[PDB]
């Protein structure tokens, strides 16, 4: 609750109980944003026009309106091998969209 | 069940991050069923019939296909006279519910000459490619294997097929997405929402 | 606090102190994402592979890892009038990323 | 800021069905004005017009309009008429003696004028030099002739500095060259200096 930022999340899919497809890997990096959208939004967390407008507007009606969120921007593929809906074996050197490489607020 | 061919592929990408692959998908096809005629007067080699269930994504462009074939001589006495021969597989057009290579239309993809028993990989990404676009017509999706054994070998040279249990013939196919990962990250989208509620 | 949506919200430039340099339009509507990415995460939020992953991981981890945002997707343009930083009076048709088009979880 | 600008804002949204051809429009009022009176070797009203048009460079340019407004300057005997004709020509090389008897010019538009009013010059070809400046030869400046015909006003003109009322500006239409990406980028940036 600070400033919107990229933090470390291990993921493990025994926990969440995707082991019954994910052949590998068993645990991967996905990392997490965490922090608030807190005025004044700066170049590093690559904010839109309507995130600048919504913060402004929370900063002035603040029991009215919400402030942006801290989300992933783009995401980075990681390496996967699982079995497909019909059981076939599948390996994808790029499984994109599993892991955080930037933040920003929205 | 997931080769270790399959989990190798993986440890090969993974371990060498540095070195992109050409191919980004990856999939196993075992051997749906097998139609094995023995060697005769006639025909002097083991014939083989092996039918897959090889299904592509429409959407998808493959770029290779691999036959992993198990190669041995069948535990013969006097074995130790020497192994060594060769190995022709046919993308089978038409066929022909009577012998194997005796009857139907065949169209060769790869020659083989063997010597270690284990592993081989036959490049037949032509039959593959043909079975995507299936277009009906004639019923394909097989291929038929022969196995020719040489002089001073085992008169039982063979491939590792049904309905045995261990070592069994599969497909390896490697492709690549015609949209470039839009589509293919749509789906994969939507079958993960089914494996979100699983 | 219920399902990701698009919600109405009507931003005036005065109150946020944007009057300075926007001359046209006065008011204009720039909508919000309201509601929660409760599990289960639907076609209609268009969601991410992390955003499915954290949410799960959410449900094993609550206290540890939070679940995905409700923000913002595409944003529409508007047409806006206003004075440069050289004060010049500028007019552009499609002002991007002004107003919400599709809410979703991330 | 003319209400020409105004006007276009209230176009574009009218008009949704309609789509503009140009995205960015800026007017740039005029910076400073030489005016030189007719006499007998040169029977015409001389003006030179001094802008500060800047376009950024990623950006590329359309249209642009040199807006000026004809009228008979409140001369006795105005109610003889109003009819002439003016013309404007990008300045290259100029020189602080005369208006158009001297420097270098080049011949943008000739304007026959009747009504008291604006009219609109379409000098596209001007402020595109102007922006590929590439240093060399001052420019950003062009200059407007004003020629009174036999009936009609003697002191037909168009209406400049030192003047305060209905002063000539520019209107110019552009569009991004990297199709708005570019452009959006910029404007974040811009609206973030303004955030604060
Ligand atoms: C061979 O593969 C095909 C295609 O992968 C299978 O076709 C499926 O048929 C079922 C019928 O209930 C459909 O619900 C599926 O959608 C089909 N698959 C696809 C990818 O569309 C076919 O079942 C397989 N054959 C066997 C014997 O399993
Ligand atoms: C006329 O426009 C020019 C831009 O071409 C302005 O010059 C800029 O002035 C700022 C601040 O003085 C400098 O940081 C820039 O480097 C200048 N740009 C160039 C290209 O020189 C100038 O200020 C404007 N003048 C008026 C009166 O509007
Ligand atoms: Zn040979
Ligand atoms: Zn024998
Ligand atoms: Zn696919
Ligand atoms: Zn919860
Ligand atoms: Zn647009
Ligand atoms: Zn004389
Ligand atoms: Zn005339
Ligand atoms: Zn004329
Ligand atoms: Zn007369
Ligand atoms: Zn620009």
Redesign the interface.
């Not at chain 2, 980004?24 to 096809?29: A, D, E, K, L």
């Not at chain 2, 079958?191 to 979100?196: L, R, T, V, Y």
């Given at each position: 609750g600070s400033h919107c930022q990229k933090t470390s999340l291990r993921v493990n899919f025994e926990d969440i109980g995707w082991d019954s497809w994910i052949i590998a890997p068993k645990e991967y990096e996905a990392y997490e944003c965490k922090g608030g959208c807190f005025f004044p939004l700066a170049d590093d967390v690559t904010p839109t026009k309507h995130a600048i407008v919504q913060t402004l507007v929370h900063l002035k009606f603040p029991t009215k309106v919400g402030k942006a969120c801290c989300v992933p921007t783009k995401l980075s593929p990681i390496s996967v091998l699982y079995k497909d809906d019909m059981g076939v074996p599948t390996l994808k050197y790029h499984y994109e969209g599993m892991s955080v490489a930037e933040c920003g607020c929205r | 069940?997931?080769?270790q061919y399959?989990?190798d592929?993986?440890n090969r990408?993974?371990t060498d991050k540095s070195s992109?692959?050409a191919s980004?998908?990856?999939?196993?096809?075992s051997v749906e069923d097998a139609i094995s005629t023995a060697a005769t007067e006639d025909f002097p080699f083991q014939k083989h019939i092996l039918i897959f269930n090889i299904?592509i994504p429409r959407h998808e462009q493959i770029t290779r296909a691999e036959l992993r074939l198990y190669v041995s001589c069948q535990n013969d006495v006097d074995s130790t006279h020497g192994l060594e021969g060769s190995m022709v597989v046919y993308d089978v057009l038409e066929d022909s519910e009577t012998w194997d290579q005796a009857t139907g239309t065949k169209t060769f993809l790869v020659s083989q000459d063997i010597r270690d028993e284990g592993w081989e990989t036959l490049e037949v990404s032509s039959a593959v490619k043909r079975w995507v676009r299936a277009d009906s017509t004639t019923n394909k999706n097989k291929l038929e294997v022969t196995v020719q054994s040489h002089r001073e070998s085992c008169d039982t040279l063979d491939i590792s097929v049904p309905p045995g249990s261990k070592n069994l013939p599969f497909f390896v196919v490697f492709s690549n997405d015609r949209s470039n990962?839009t589509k293919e990250?749509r789906l994969?989208?939507?079958?993960?929402?089914?494996?979100?509620?699983?």
């Open positions: - | 069940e997931p080769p399959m989990i592929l993986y990408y993974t992109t692959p980004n998908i990856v999939r196993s096809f299904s990962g990250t994969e989208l939507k079958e993960m929402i089914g494996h979100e509620q699983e």
